[PDB]
Amino acid sequence: GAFGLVGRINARYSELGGPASWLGYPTSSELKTPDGRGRFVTFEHGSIYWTATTGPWEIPGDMLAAWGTQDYEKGSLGYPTGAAVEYNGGLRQQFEGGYVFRTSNNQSYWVRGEISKKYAEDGIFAQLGFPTGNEKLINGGAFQEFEKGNIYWSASTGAHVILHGDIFDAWGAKGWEQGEYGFPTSDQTAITAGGQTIDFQNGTIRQVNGRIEESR
Known part of the structure; x- marks a missing residue:
């Protein structure tokens, strides 16, 4: 099927090597987004989105589907603001309202808002690995699951990291964030002697010499 593209989207397609790129050929001409702000074009293996204020960006098909689960540009993620780039054996792509990932296990998930901001801090990926799902809204705030732990957020507490293991299980036995401890107010932090x-x-919950200690 023959398609002729225009403006900054055609520009970006050219920058990627056109049909020779991973996108393959166009499967649409330039389309308006529902919200009357943007434009996009579909290709064999993904799409390019554009706004006057975000510029034109390709999104691979799997990450495009994941972006779709919170309703693409109409969701709080908004528009892509950069390319999907190699990230810890996967891909990370920045959006106005967070990030979309290809994981190293070839799955795709998004992170958004305050949890996104925490997840993007240096050292946090090393602690958590990839998301294993999208954000979940709960009574009091939100949380998200990653390979090696979770991030929890409430307006009063901010976004904080807790790892899988005995401290997490001790909090779980008391109903995690809905129980008497409530939300994490600090990140889980290593201390001396393990x-x-x-x-x-x-x-507070502590693990020292492989023993759990609790205060309320």
Whole structure:
């Protein structure tokens, strides 16, 4: 099928090597987005989106589908603001409202808002690995699951990291964030001699010499 492209999207397609690129051939001419702000073009293996203020960016098909689960540009992620680039054996792509990932296990998930901001801090990926799902809204705020732990957020507590393991399980036995401890107020932090510690709204849990210690 023959298609002739225009403006900054055609520009970006050319920059990627046109049909020789991973996108393959166009499967549409330039289309308007629902919200009357953007333009896009579909290709065999993904799409390019554009706004006057974000510029033209290709999104691979799997990450395009994942972006779709919160309704693409109409969702809080908004428009892509950069390319999908190699990231820890996967891809990371920045959006106005967060990030979309190809994971190293060839799955695709998004991160958004305050949880995105925490996940993007240096050292946090090393602690968590890839997302294993999208954000979940809960009573009091939100949380998200990653390979090696979770991030929890409430407006009062901010976004904080807790790892899988005995401290997480001890909090779980008391109903995690809905229970008497409430939300994590600190990131789980290593201490000397192998220990771990984290603060919650209404107490602290420590692991030292492989023993759990609790305060309320």
